[PDB]
Amino acid sequence: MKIRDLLKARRGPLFSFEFFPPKDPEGEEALFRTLEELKAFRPAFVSITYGAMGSTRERSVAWAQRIQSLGLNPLAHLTVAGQSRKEVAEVLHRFVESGVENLLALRGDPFRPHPEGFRYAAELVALIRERYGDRVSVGGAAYPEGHPESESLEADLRHFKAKVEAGLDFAITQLFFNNAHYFGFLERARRAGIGIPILPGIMPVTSYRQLRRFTEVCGASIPGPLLAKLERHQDDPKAVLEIGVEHAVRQVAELLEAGVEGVHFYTLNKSPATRMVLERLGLRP
Amino acid sequence: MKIRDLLKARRGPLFSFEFFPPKDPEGEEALFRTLEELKAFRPAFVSITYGAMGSTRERSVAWAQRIQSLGLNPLAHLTVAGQSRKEVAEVLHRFVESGVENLLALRGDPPRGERVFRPHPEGFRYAAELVALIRERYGDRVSVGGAAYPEGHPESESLEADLRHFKAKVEAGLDFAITQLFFNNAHYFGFLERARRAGIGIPILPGIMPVTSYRQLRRFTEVCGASIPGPLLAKLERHQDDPKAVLEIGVEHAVRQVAELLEAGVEGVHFYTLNKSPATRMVLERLGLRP
Ligand SMILES: Cc1cc2nc3c(=O)[nH]c(=O)nc-3n(C[C@H](O)[C@H](O)[C@H](O)COP(=O)(O)OP(=O)(O)OC[C@H]3O[C@@H](n4cnc5c(N)ncnc54)[C@H](O)[C@@H]3O)c2cc1C
Ligand SMILES: Cc1cc2nc3c(=O)[nH]c(=O)nc-3n(C[C@H](O)[C@H](O)[C@H](O)COP(=O)(O)OP(=O)(O)OC[C@H]3O[C@@H](n4cnc5c(N)ncnc54)[C@H](O)[C@@H]3O)c2cc1C
Ligand code: NA
Ligand code: NA
């Protein structure tokens, strides 16, 4: 089912999970195990990421199909970096010919475009709509704290708006650790005339180091209390997992009481954190 | 001049500096040096903090008097913690008697180590009650400000409660507010759009702290609830043992922040100086704002 329709039909929240194409047999087995655990929560959709320059193209397709084989509804990510327009179009056709009806149109990271490539995710959005109309549902990235490369936050929101207007049905946010970042962004988007659902992206912390590297790359901020607490227990993995889960639970309880349309979980191909968050919220069907 | 009137009269930004009353001659000499340096930037006001439970209230009055006599325009902070209503009204009166016409009404914090705030048995519980007192007694003859928390106050049950409590505080009779420190302008802009959508129309001035010490940043944000951008955090952490590199990183970060707030047309910027001149000077110099 197209996410655009799920969002209107379902009055309770959509839970989604994000996974990446593992790069070796061991990784693949780990993801299969993670899938077997998380599918019992009956996610509204499951995303499969795409290597920035087209490096995972085959594996992304194969995992999209595998998600379908489990009875789950894939959201297929697709990037424009490092690919001709024709390459991007070919991969897109292969997703669509597989029965994938949900795409997440992204730029990807290296930034100079491919000589016959696109420059912006909005050009892929426009491609998809030009070729497939409403036969698919298209999402894009949003950055509550602003994309690192944007000259200003005003330009960031304007650029996001242009992307929406290319034909987005929904957006998924970059990770954030204080719900104020999300609600702020949401209000600013609405003031800018944007009406599409915008789903909060949540990463439950399972490792101090990982938190540090992720926020460093993507530009997200960490609350001072959370940082201190993680820093103290950084050497006790069980404590860290506990602290991350508690924090995501606090985050997600408020998002749901506020009426968000769904929550997208960055799982990093592991089940425990996401499982614990959902079980603590009373959300195991 | 009332900050209420400066904000309406002036179409460009107000610049303001926050200072704390030093405890001793050495601290006083240091602040007078900082003041001498920073007064060149011609701030529209200068704020003087108040020690949470009133034990240093006469230092706060003395510094308000010093600032007023230096031709600078004091914004006197005042808390309700650990003090009776009478005690609070007495200090309030002294400020006004000394010519102060701008007050920042605050709750104050319980002692370090205590997690429950409990009012004085005959004191106020919320800043809003101080606001109401001020207006009851002085009407519009003074200008009254409050605090705002773009990332939500650590004690608020939710961000929705946070905003509703802020709105009630505004409605008790605020002319402006100043934010808690923040390190990404998205936090400030988001809060503004939330406040507006809640029907708050007072000017809300961003509060900026230029980072001069890794460990201080960590403690302040641990206490405040504020967040640190991952890139900034990464850089400061790498260089935390070189104070000059930290100062340069903190200055550069604040320059980027302030440059965007001014271009967006904020009504001013309030600097948390911690009684030091170098970082704030450098920020403003680099923006070309030395007259
Ligand atoms: C939910 C989610 C999933 C992701 N999945 C993947 C993935 O599978 N693979 C991957 O490689 N990356 C992925 N990313 C990351 C993404 O590719 C990077 O964040 C990338 O740097 C930006 O992609 P975008 O589509 O958000 O960019 P765009 O919307 O193209 O924006 C890129 C930059 O250009 C600016 N810009 C936009 N339009 C204009 C314009 N008209 N003029 C000038 N500047 C403009 C933007 O403000 C930004 O600075 C994901 C991100 C999110 C939030
Ligand atoms: C610019 C600035 C300057 C400051 N200067 C000083 C200073 O000089 N001295 C000092 O000691 N502290 C100072 N503070 C810190 C301040 O005292 C603390 O943040 C304190 O914890 C809260 O004070 P407040 O006036 O913001 O609180 P209030 O507005 O009283 O709010 C306190 C808490 O109770 C909640 N609340 C408010 N109204 C209600 C209600 N009716 N019912 C239920 N809950 C409610 C709030 O949401 C919050 O959770 C300053 C803060 C800022 C931003
Ligand atoms: Na819905
Ligand atoms: Na003004």
Residue numbers in the entry:
A (entry chain B): 1 to 110, 117 to 291
B (entry chain A): 1 to 291
The authors write:
The flavoprotein methylenetetrahydrofolate reductase (MTHFR) catalyzes the reduction of N5, N10-methylenetetrahydrofolate (CH2-H4folate) to N5-methyltetrahydrofolate (CH3-H4folate), committing a methyl group from the folate cycle to the methionine one. MTHFR requires flavin adenine nucleotide (FAD) as a noncovalently bound cofactor, which acts as an intermediary electron shuttle. All MTHFRs share a highly conserved catalytic domain, despite varying oligomerization states, such as a dimer in Thermus thermophilus HB8 (tMTHFR) versus a tetramer in Escherichia coli (eMTHFR). All MTHFR catalytic domains share the same β8α8 barrel topology, a typical triose phosphate isomerase barrel structure.
In the absence of folate, two different FAD-bound tMTHFR structures with different intermonomer interfaces have been described. In one of the structures, only one active site in the dimer is occupied by FAD (half-FAD occupancy, dimer mode 1) while both active sites are occupied in the other (full-FAD occupancy, dimer mode 2). It is worth noting that tMTHFR purifies in the half-FAD occupancy state; only the addition of excess FAD leads to the observance of the full-FAD occupancy state. In contrast, in the folate-free tMTHFR structure, the distance between Thr and Glu is found to be 5.7 Å, suggesting that the triad expansion to include the interacting Thr49 and formation of a tetrad is triggered or is coupled to binding of a specific folate form. Indeed, the Thr coordination in the folate-free tMTHFR structure is very similar to that in the eMTHFR structure with or without CH3-H4folate. It has to be noted that while the Thr residue exhibits a dynamic behavior, the positions of the Ser, His, and Glu residues in the triad remain largely unchanged.
